[PDB]
Amino acid sequence: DSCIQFTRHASDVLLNLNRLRSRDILTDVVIVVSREQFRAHKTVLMACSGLFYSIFTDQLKCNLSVINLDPEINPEGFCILLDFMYTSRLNLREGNIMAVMATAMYLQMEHVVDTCRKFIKASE
Amino acid sequence: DSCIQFTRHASDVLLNLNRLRSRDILTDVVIVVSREQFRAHKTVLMACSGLFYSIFTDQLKCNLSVINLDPEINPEGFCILLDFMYTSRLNLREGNIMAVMATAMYLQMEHVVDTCRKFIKASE
């Protein structure tokens, strides 16, 4: 086509989706990770994670308002990945890298798994 | 903070949101523009448009599944702007610029209004 493109559009959309999340506006699911609960938008979760894409395209699970993750999932690891989904920013630290990598593998977030593997290999 | 950032993340999220729209997955509103209907995600509309941000933060309108736009709104102009919301790409042409600019003013999409004004001024 002969379209023009607004370079910052995708980043501005994501910034607004994060603002809606922070204000709990039109959030439609709560992700339960052991004792912790995280409110989010199903569409953002599906757009970032192979696991959520699978869950919310399922004819029964698409209608659930609560999703319980595997008890082995670390809440801080999930929190870091949820923030990444809504911001493109990953708070990767020596103290959380193993939990973040395990959570990203479970959530099927290939690019995160890739940078965790690379950061781990550099430290060995 | 000491975060790392994935450059293509925002663009990849938007590409997936557009894929969900094309497959009518978790769309939660229909925008009626005279004889035409457009299915979309309320969160994407709010993230792109001052008018939809206002509508869906309203305590009564947030729950509506159908929104009827002003009869003066051109369906093609709306279609072009809806595509832009989900892609960052604006199909701006001599034959649609007036309709696109009028629709962007109504929808409160300042960056679109700006490029339409600039393209019009260059042709006079």
Binding site: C3, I4, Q5, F6, T7 | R89, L90, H111, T115
Partner: peptide, 4 residues
């Protein structure tokens, strides 16, 4: 705005 750019030519993509």
């Amino acid at each position: 705005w750019v030519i993509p």
